[PDB]
Amino acid sequence: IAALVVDNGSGMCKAGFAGDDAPRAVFPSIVGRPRDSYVGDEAQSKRGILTLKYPIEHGIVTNWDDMEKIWHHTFYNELRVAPEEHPVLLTEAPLNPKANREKMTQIMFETFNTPAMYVAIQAVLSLYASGRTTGIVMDSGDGVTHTVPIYEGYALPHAILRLDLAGRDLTDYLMKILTERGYSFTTTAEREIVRDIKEKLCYVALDFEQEMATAASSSSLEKSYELPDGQVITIGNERFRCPEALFQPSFLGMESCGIHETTFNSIMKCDVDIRKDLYANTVLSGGTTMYPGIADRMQKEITALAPSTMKIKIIAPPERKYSVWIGGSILASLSTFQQMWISKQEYDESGPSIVHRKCF
Amino acid sequence: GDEVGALVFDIGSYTVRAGYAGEDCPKVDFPTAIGMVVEGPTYYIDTNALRVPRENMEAISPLKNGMVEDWDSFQAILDHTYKMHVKSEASLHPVLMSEAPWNTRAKREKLTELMFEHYNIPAFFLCKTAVLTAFANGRSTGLILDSGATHTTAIPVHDGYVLQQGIVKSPLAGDFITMQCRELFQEMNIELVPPYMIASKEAVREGSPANWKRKEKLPQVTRSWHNYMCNCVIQDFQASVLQVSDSTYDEQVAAQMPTVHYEFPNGYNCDFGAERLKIPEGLFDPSNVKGLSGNTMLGVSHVVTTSVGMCDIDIRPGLYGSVIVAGGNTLIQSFTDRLNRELSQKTPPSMRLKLIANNTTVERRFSSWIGGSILASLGTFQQMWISKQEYEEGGKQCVERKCP
Amino acid sequence: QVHQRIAELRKAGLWSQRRLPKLQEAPRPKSHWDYLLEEMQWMATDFAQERRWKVAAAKKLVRTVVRHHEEKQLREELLTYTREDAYSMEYVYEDEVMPLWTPPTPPQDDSDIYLDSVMCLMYEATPIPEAK
Amino acid sequence: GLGDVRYRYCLTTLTVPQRCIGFARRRVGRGGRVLLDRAHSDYDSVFHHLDLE
Amino acid sequence: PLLPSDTGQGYRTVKAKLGSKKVRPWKWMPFTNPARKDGAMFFHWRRAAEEGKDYPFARFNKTVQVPVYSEQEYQLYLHDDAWTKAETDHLFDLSRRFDLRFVVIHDRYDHQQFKKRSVEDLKERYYHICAKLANVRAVPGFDAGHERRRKEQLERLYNRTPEQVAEEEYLLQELR
Ligand SMILES: Nc1ncnc2c1ncn2[C@@H]1O[C@H](COP(=O)(O)OP(=O)(O)OP(=O)(O)O)[C@@H](O)[C@H]1O
Ligand SMILES: Nc1ncnc2c1ncn2[C@@H]1O[C@H](COP(=O)(O)OP(=O)(O)OP(=O)(O)O)[C@@H](O)[C@H]1O
């Protein structure tokens, strides 16, 4: 009966019905082509036989036919509902070009015949999911990281900042260091193994030098992990060396500022008055923020940077990775939002620019 | 026909503003100052690259008095803008650019040549900032009062054309306020420590000496970069504390006003009283400013009156009837009220003085970019683009003819 | 007082400063630049109105969301109008029709004259001057 | 004043949300959309006449 | 003060109706503008069924008609004892460019390569030239001094000091 909510990301795609508390289907966004097409997990196992491509890069779609196949797969196979029967809500990364919005609207209306649709910004959806009026959202997914300040739900485009450090880089760095300790990971299978290790084991250190000294002397920070072959490996100081790259990009070799510095700069860039609220309503989102202990380190860093009289308060819900989708799910179920839909007749009469007329 | 995929650029001494035509607010806004290292040189441009300290790095800007001087730096800035923020080939997008009212002909010609030959754009057009500011508010005729970082100027506009004769310039602008702030701090003996030097800070009682530690791992940096960081701190102080007195500055009345609280990066915090009012009074009465006894300087209100008085009489009712305020420096608290009081007092009663109400940051700073977007959106404007085929012959000949 | 105000009217000198003469004229039809200026005015108005609506709608949606969350907790125990009104019925006054601000239209014939901001000299001619 | 009509505001009533909505002005949007521009008054509370006998 | 924009929503009672109709495809297409002499092609969002139709804005390209003359005409009729041919040609070129907006023309007029002129002088010269040319062209079958006086009076009124304004106001009120 209700509408659909589809969220597209560089690493994972999430789809579900409005009003539900969690996405019904989650799968990786990859398209396999022969050396018919394959998508998601079916392509992953076939990837040994097939050639793989990614239709999204740094949150920006770069190939459209692949994206069309991704949407077709999502709807018909994962959701098993004909699109023309339901309204469809979509998500968009901040600072997205106009042409992308127009092409997306054209595809959605003409190819799939959806009766209505809307496009929303992921950061504001995360803010909705948190349930706050004014705040600053820190978003770090698989491909890209953004910091977006919001004032009464209106995202200030000029204060937004961007950073090209995300989970993919951290996984590659973990592979590099684990090879450097003496193991051997080359192909995509070992890359998935390393991603699993990163998700399972790594954590953020509150004080890097003290933890380094402890790992230098003590055995109390070591761990072991079991591989698919049944053989085991040992992992040590690497556990917190990898996530530390967030606050010290120099490790990866990039001359860029850390996430805390970027957030502080974004807050400072806005007007003087609203700074007080942003400090007290800082929000974290995305999969990359799921590392244990990140919130305390962030709070300590921003407390060091920020003026003494301000009050800093980090917010990190346990399910923050799906928070972006949860926000969209809440929004679609609202009553007042029903008047904000773009109808099919409006697209027919006006054209794709109608999206630039409504979806905000 | 109102939706041609065009881009519009706006560049100033403080920040560079770019975006897509038809949008309401500029998409990207980053500072104009960039870092340069010799041994062609290497440029670090955006905010993230600029903050990181490094050895032998100097701070430079391509603009001088509102005109381009360092063409290599300008080309690097445009390259960074395109590649990182736009992420689209320049050959596909028509471009619109703003220019200072007094920009000379040869520099316009060289800019057009650079764009067409190097960036290979499909179409081009140039306009002056005053006209675009007038368009943003929807006025064909009006007086534009602009107070940026470098100059405070008054430009009259009639039927969408700039009247060259009436332009009046003054040097009292944001940089003058920054110099005044530096003088104040030197008088108070407050040491300025830029954030990059601080490793950590402790809380200290009001007025007491600061307590902080230095980052030992810092490689030595140059003079200009350190000075630029100090200027950033002082700019923040300007934005936070200063205020303009409603009437003429009076020490006794100011002394009775409540104070304000500020905290520096190194943890030092002290309360400011009459000093936060005495400084901005310079913009309205430069004569009494210490160290600048030269009375030949003109205040903002006197600048406006002189600029209007130099135009044709029949147009003066039109100019006084629509006065537009623009520029970042006008954002100082209580500036518009003092300007309105002065103008209403000094203007002859026979003329109906009016000030356009636009007192918000986004539209007060980005007015020129908004006007450019509006102009690019117009359907009938599509006739006026300069094309590559037109660039071949009339690129030099018709550029003089095309954009008056 | 009458001799002194006849002195004063010979003072300020109707021959000196008080009341003024007529303006001349020459007709001329509109041109491309005038149409561009009108379209610019219309577009600027549209831009401003859109942005302002934009802010208001965002605020309203945020307030609705926060109140929805509050209602969820407690359970533990104006911006649009219909299509028909937009494109039908003319809001006639009775005892005429309300205007509508449309973008400029191309001239069907050479009849639209260019006007300007003379303002001070009130428009439309003077029928009966003195026998010059 | 200039006294132009296209810049005038006047009282109006909608049909679906049937009520007097204060001073309003009609205008044409970007693509084809027809919009109503609403002004402000300090008597907005009392303007709910309807049916004007 | 807000503004309501038209919408076809607020409910989903329209499950029908919308489910029986299909949209007309759109296209991103190039177009030719007759107003452009170079023939350059720009791209366009438009309904795919109306390809090739001329640009509907080209009907706004209307120019102001300004006369022209040859050497022989300037030899016979337009010769003047206070204007060189080059100066008049400059005046007429400026008039064509700026569409007889004489204030703008006076602003942009080259006052150093040619002796300074007031706007009234420009108007007078232009009207004399055009009138004589039209008169000759007709098959068998302006007042500068007044404007100058008006502008001088306006200038005198403008520089009136406030005490004079108050004195005039007092005298006026005495007459009721
Ligand atoms: N603790 C963790 N739990 C889950 N995923 C984690 C964790 N730490 C890092 N990750 C990485 O986070 C990524 C998942 O992030 P997410 O699902 O938010 O991405 P996305 O939606 O594709 O991003 P984007 O929209 O920014 O392109 C995966 O690469 C996963 O390896
Ligand atoms: N919020 C603020 N309050 C007070 N002053 C401000 C504020 N924001 C900016 N300024 C002042 O305005 C200056 C920037 O002005 P603006 O944005 O108009 O520059 P610009 O147009 O790039 O300059 P220019 O035309 O001289 O090249 C800042 O350097 C500072 O001096």
Numbering used by the authors:
A (entry chain J): 5 to 39, 51 to 375
B (entry chain L): 8 to 46, 65 to 429
C (entry chain G): 780 to 856, 2220 to 2237, 2243 to 2279
D (entry chain H): 432 to 484
E (entry chain I): 70 to 210, 218 to 252
From the paper:
The human Tat-interactive protein, 60 kDa (TIP60) complex, a fusion of the yeast nucleosome acetyltransferase of histone H4 (NuA4) and switch/sucrose nonfermentable related 1 (SWR1) complexes, is involved in both histone acetylation and H2A.Z-H2B histone exchange and is essential for cell viability, playing a role, among other cellular processes, in gene regulation and DNA double-strand break repair. TIP60 can modify nucleosomes through covalent and noncovalent mechanisms by using its histone acetyltransferase (HAT) module and its E1A binding protein P400 (EP400) chromatin remodeler subunit, respectively.
Within the ARP module, the HSA of EP400 functions as a “pillar” that is surrounded by BAF53a, ACTB, DMAP1, and EPC1 (right), leaving the other half of HSA exposed to the solvent. The PMD of EP400 folds back toward the N terminus, integrating itself into the ARP module and contributing to the surface that tethers the HAT module to the rest of the complex. Specifically, R807 and H811 in the pre-HSA interact with D168 and K131 in DMAP1, respectively, whereas R807 and K809 of the pre-HSA interact with Y2261 and with D2259 and I2260 of the PMD, respectively. Notably, the R807 residue of the pre-HSA, which participates in interactions with both DMAP1 and the PMD, has been identified as a cancer-associated mutation (R807H). Additionally, D162 and R170 in the SANT domain of DMAP1 form salt bridges and hydrogen-bond interactions with R426 and D184 of BAF53a, respectively.
